[PDB]
């Protein structure tokens, strides 16, 4: 629940902590990672304000760098939004 | 106006038995929507809300058409109060199949919130009374307005501040 | 097992296979059906933590994993 | 468990579906929910699916939960 | 008894039920079986058949039949059997 906080640096480091834990206890991490990935992908295209777009895009950057397990199978939905941007 | 108030009157007096003509009337009213000055658009949408409040579910094969009408006619010059009255009427008359199209009305709600808040913010007050009516509907889309209504409890005046916090509590 | 109390869990899930399978499916009903403004009811009442239990996300991910293989096939 | 087993052996499948006519207490939209147990009532004319297909499919699906129970509709 | 009980319960014959080949029976240059004109004659192109038929209680039970025409106008015939025409 620290993934949604006031300062953007808190989110930037908390998603990295989540990505690091994505190989320790993955049973309770990976589905939640899927949920927040879907939430961010929905907001990235249904939101209409540039700072929100910025935060979503670089949150996706730091998540995709910090966790490779939730990366590969979701390449098509994660590209269908970013590619026409 | 006479041609529309006649149909309004007969439907209102008769009830849920002339519903077989919905395949003709609403396609007959969208053409009237298409070419008309903003002088009577308020009256047209008010009478359409009156149709909705008496005919609930059989509008289902035309709800995409009514949101299409609102989408290609959603300016400031159109009565935003009448538009949100239409939205609350169709939501209340529909009550459950709303999932297919939450983001459209939700983005319209964002635009209404962030466009105008003048005259004691009566339209923001109405929209905060409209967002609470949606009920369990936000079980998967509760990440767009909830940060917004969290933000607008310290970045605005005090007339609608308590309205926003009551909206937060009720949601 | 996580949600129910132990005597009720024993009464409903360990005694016979037919009733066990039907209430197993009722657990899925108590989540799927309330998405459409209808709430199911059982005669031995069950706690309402079923529809908000966090564990369903793994089942959703399991469907995603299988259906990706189906679509790539 | 005390090995006291109350098995299920028999089932009654009450299916009050007279396809084509609606009850007079519930209004309906012209397109409505009409598929029943994965068989459509428009592909079959009057009564080849009123019972003798819906019930057959329903019994075949109930066979998966317990194959040692006999059914009669 | 059983055949004569079920026989008055078929007021409509399904095209896929009576013939799977009728579904593909299209795009053949043969004209509708009633048109013939020496010299000046437009080409009649058979396009499609409706899936549903009908019967008439006549002690021989004919079949009303229709064809979707390339001209866009339906061509309706009636098929009879056990009677020389």
**What does the DSSP assignment read for E29-77?**
S---TT---SSS-PPP-EEEE-SB-EE--SSS--EEEEEEETTSS-EEE
Calculate how close chain C gets to B96, using CA atoms only, in Å.
6
Q: Give φ, ψ of E76 to 5 degrees.
A: -110, 125
Task: Please give the Cα distance from E8 to E17 (Å, whole number).
Answer: 17
Token pair for D38? 């994965």
CB pairs under 8 A between A and B: 13
Question: What is the enclosing helix (H) or strand (E) of D63?
Answer: helix D54-65
B144 in contact with chain A, both atoms CB, cutoff 8 A: yes
Collect all residues of chain D within an 8 Å Cβ-Cβ radius of residue B57. Answer: 27, 29
Token pair for C45? 């009442």
Q: Give φ, ψ of A3 to 5 degrees.
A: -65, -20
Q: Look up residue D39 and give its DSSP letter.
A: B
Query: CA nearest B74: which of B102, B32, B47, B45?
Result: B45
* B158 CB-near residues (< 8 Å, 6+ apart): none
Choosing among A1, A22, A31, which should be mutated to test the C contact, i.e. which has the most C CBs within 10 A? A31
C60 in contact with chain A, both atoms CB, cutoff 8 A: yes
8 A C-beta contact, residue B133 and residue B91: yes
Q: Do B139 and C37 touch (CB under 8 A)?
A: no
Whose tokens are 């297909």? That residue is: D53
Calculate how close chain A gets to B159, using CA atoms only, in Å.
25
Q: Do E12 and D45 touch (CB under 8 A)?
A: yes
C35 in contact with chain B, both atoms CB, cutoff 8 A: yes
Whose tokens are 């004209």? That residue is: E31
Task: Please give the Cα distance from A59 to A3 (Å, whole number).
Answer: 10
Choosing among D65, D67, D68, which should be mutated to test the C contact, i.e. which has the most C CBs within 10 A? D65
Token pair for B127? 């929209």
Collect all residues of chain B within an 8 Å Cβ-Cβ radius of residue A43. Answer: 143-144
Closest D-chain CA to B20 = D30
Task: Please give the Cα distance from E71 to C71 (Å, whole number).
Answer: 42
Task: Please give the Cα distance from E9 to D45 (Å, whole number).
Answer: 10
D71 forms beta bridges with D11
8 A C-beta contact, residue C65 and residue A73: yes
Resolution of the deposited coordinates, in angstroms? 3.9
Task: Please give the Cα distance from A16 to A70 (Å, whole number).
Answer: 13
**What does the DSSP assignment read for chain B?**
-HHHHHHHHHHHHH-TTSGGGHHHHHHHHHHHHHS--TTTHHHHHHHHHHHHHH--STTGGGHHHHHHHHHHT--SSS-HHHHHHHHHHHHHHH-S-GGGGHHHHHHHHHHHHHH---GGGHHHHHHHHHHGGGGGGGSS-TTSHHHHHHHTTTSS-STTHHHHHHHHHH-
B16 to A25, A74, B51, C36: CA distances (angstroms) = 58, 49, 11, 25
**What does the DSSP assignment read for C31-50?**
HHGGGGT-----SS---GGG
Calculate how close chain B gets to A63, using CA atoms only, in Å.
18
CB pairs under 8 A between D and E: 6
Token pair for B100? 């297919």
Answer whether B touches D (≥3 Cβ pairs < 8 Å): yes
């Amino acid at each position: 629940m620290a993934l949604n906080d006031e300062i953007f640096g808190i989110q930037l480091e908390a998603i990295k902590i989540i990505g690091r834990l994505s190989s320790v206890n993955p049973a309770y991490v990976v589905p939640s990672l899927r949920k927040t990935l879907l939430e961010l992908l929905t907001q990235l295209k249904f939101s209409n304000m540039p700072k929100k777009k910025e935060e979503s895009a670089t949150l996706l950057c730091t998540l995709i760098n910090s966790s490779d397990e939730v990366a590969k199978p979701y390449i098509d939905p994660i590209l269908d939004v970013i590619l026409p941007k | 106006t006479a041609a529309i108030q006649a149909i309004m009157h007969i439907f209102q007096n008769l009830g849920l038995r002339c519903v077989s003509f919905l395949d003709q009337i609403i396609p007959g009213i969208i053409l009237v929507m298409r070419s008309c000055p903003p002088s009577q658009l308020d009256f047209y949408f008010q009478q359409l809300g009156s149709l909705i409040s008496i005919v609930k579910q059989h509008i289902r094969p035309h709800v995409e058409k009514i949101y299409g009408v609102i989408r290609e006619f959603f300016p400031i010059i159109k009565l935003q109060i009448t538009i949100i009255s239409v939205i609350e009427s169709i939501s209340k008359a529909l009550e459950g199949e709303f999932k297919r199209f939450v983001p459209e009305t939700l983005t319209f709600f964002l635009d209404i919130l962030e466009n105008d808040q003048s005259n004691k913010r009566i339209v923001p007050i109405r929209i905060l009374k409209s967002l609470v009516t949606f009920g369990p509907n936000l079980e998967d889309y509760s990440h767009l307005i909830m940060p917004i209504v969290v933000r607008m409890t310290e970045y605005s005046a005090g007339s609608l501040k308590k309205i926003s916090i009551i909206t937060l509590g009720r949601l | 097992w996580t949600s129910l109390p132990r005597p009720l869990f024993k009464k409903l899930f360990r005694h016979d296979l037919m009733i066990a399978a039907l209430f197993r499916n009722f657990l899925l009903a108590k989540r799927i059906m309330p998405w459409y403004n209808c709430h199911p009811v059982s005669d031995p009442e069950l706690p309402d933590s079923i529809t908000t239990h966090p564990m369903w996300k793994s089942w959703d991910l399991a469907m995603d994993e299988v259906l990706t293989k189906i679509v790539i096939d | 468990i005390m090995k006291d087993r109350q098995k299920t052996v028999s089932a009654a499948l009450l299916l009050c579906l007279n396809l084509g006519v609606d009850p007079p207490d519930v209004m309906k939209t012209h397109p409505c929910a009409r598929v029943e147990a994965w068989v459509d009532p428009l592909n079959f004319q009057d009564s080849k699916k009123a019972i003798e297909q819906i019930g057959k499919n329903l019994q075949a699906q109930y066979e998966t939960l317990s194959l040692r129970t006999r059914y009669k509709q | 008894r059983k055949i004569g009980k079920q026989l008055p319960q078929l007021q409509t014959l399904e095209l896929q039920h009576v013939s799977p080949k009728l579904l593909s029976a299209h795009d053949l240059e043969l004209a509708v079986p009633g048109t013939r004109a020496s010299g000046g004659k437009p080409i009649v192109k058979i396009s499609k058949f409706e899936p549903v038929f009908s019967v008439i209680s006549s002690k021989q039970r004919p079949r009303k039949f229709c064809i979707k025409g390339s001209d866009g106008k339906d061509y309706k015939y009636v098929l009879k059997g056990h009677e020389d025409i």
